[PDB]
């Protein structure tokens with residue numbers, strides 16, 4: 001993967017505002033800000049890579065910015081951080097992974113409980129919520145994920 005990052009950074013605050021102001025919320029998230037664990041992935045780059053990770057996310061997972069950026073978030077599904085696309089996870093519920101996959105493809109909001117592992121191999125249940133995000137063109141370009149241990 002050779003993901004490219006937006007020169008000048010991402011409008012994370014603007015996107016959080018967009019999310020809290022969305023008209024027909026399918027999932028209630030309650031107020032959110034930059035203090036919580038979150039990531040923004042680019043739907044328009046190969047394998048929906050993380051292009052921004054909040055400090056709280058890195059702290060929760062134990063991974064560094066260098067270890068997460070440019071990667072699809074699925075690495076959290078294995079204690080060795082090695083998860084190949086389309087592979088059958090041995091520690092994660094297949095229907096759960098398919099639910100996330102379909103929600104992302106359809107730009108549909110979703111909330112799931114998925115088993116994840118921190119960098120040091122510590123297992124935990126991640127209550128994950130993903131909401132599609134529109135960029136300046138007004139069309140869905142990113143997805144913001146909010147992780148909860």
Ligand SMILES: Cc1cc2nc3c(=O)[nH]c(=O)nc-3n(C[C@H](O)[C@H](O)[C@H](O)COP(=O)(O)OP(=O)(O)OC[C@H]3O[C@@H](n4cnc5c(N)ncnc54)[C@H](O)[C@@H]3O)c2cc1C
Nearest residue numbers: 041073074085086087088089094097098100101143144145
């Ligand atoms: C912003 C954002 C944040 C995210 N944060 C996290 C996070 O914190 N933790 C995390 O674990 N993931 C996270 N994800 C999810 C991850 O990045 C992938 O989107 C997710 O694993 C599903 O996509 P995939 O490409 O891995 O699917 P695939 O690799 O295709 O795997 C889907 C699995 O489902 C099974 N399956 C497929 N179709 C069917 C079917 N019809 N019936 C039965 N089984 C089926 C397969 O056997 C396969 O193993 C995040 C995604 C985004 C966009």
